[PDB]
Design a binder for this molecule. Structure first.
Ligand SMILES: [Mg+2]
Ligand SMILES: [Mg+2]
Ligand SMILES: [Mg+2]
Length: 110
RNA sequence: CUCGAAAGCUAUUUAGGUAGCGCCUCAUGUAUCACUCUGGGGGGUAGAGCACUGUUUCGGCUAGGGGGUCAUCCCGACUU
């Protein structure tokens, strides 16, 4: 609603744009370069004018409310085909080819 | 010589005792009473019924738990 989500205050611009969930850190360094907003000032000190140009960039990359939708179909395409990358992805095993006998605990919990 | 019962009720340290009412008798009064016919009158019993509360048999049409279950990593449902 503010830029797609709420944006914190009393912070620099590149840090503030990070919470938009679809722009990391290197991408938000291009947006202040392409628009011209100084990151060295806070978001409080800005004008209420050029935020549309920041909002123009949000309408060109992705939005987290639909980013998580479309990335699920990338998962969902892998599951319903029954390919090996979606075979373990149904179950909960690691995917990229890690070791399974021990230590793969961030995909199985405590 | 004339008339003629009861073994009921309530209470009881009561139950085989006793006391009030019900039933007999003799007096005094006073006027109602039985039987039957024609009336008016409420009722919930025998019977009967399944509208309620329950209980019972068969049949259909089914909701379902799904019983099978094509069975789908895990999801459709195949089938009945
Ligand atoms: Mg006699
Ligand atoms: Mg005695
Ligand atoms: Mg009867």
């Amino acid at each position: 609603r503010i830029a797609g989500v709420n944006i914190p205050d009393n912070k620099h611009t590149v840090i503030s744009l990070t919470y938009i969930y679809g722009v990391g850190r290197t991408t938000a360094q291009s947006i202040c370069a392409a628009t011209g907003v100084n990151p060295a000032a806070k978001i409080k000190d800005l004008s209420d004018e050029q935020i549309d140009q920041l909002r123009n960039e949000v309408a060109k990359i992705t939005t987290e409310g639909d980013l998580r939708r479309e990335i699920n179909m990338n998962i969902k395409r892998l599951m319903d085909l029954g390919c090996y990358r979606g075979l373990r992805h149904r179950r909960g095993l690691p995917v990229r080819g890690q070791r399974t006998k021990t230590n793969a605990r961030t995909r199985k919990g405590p």
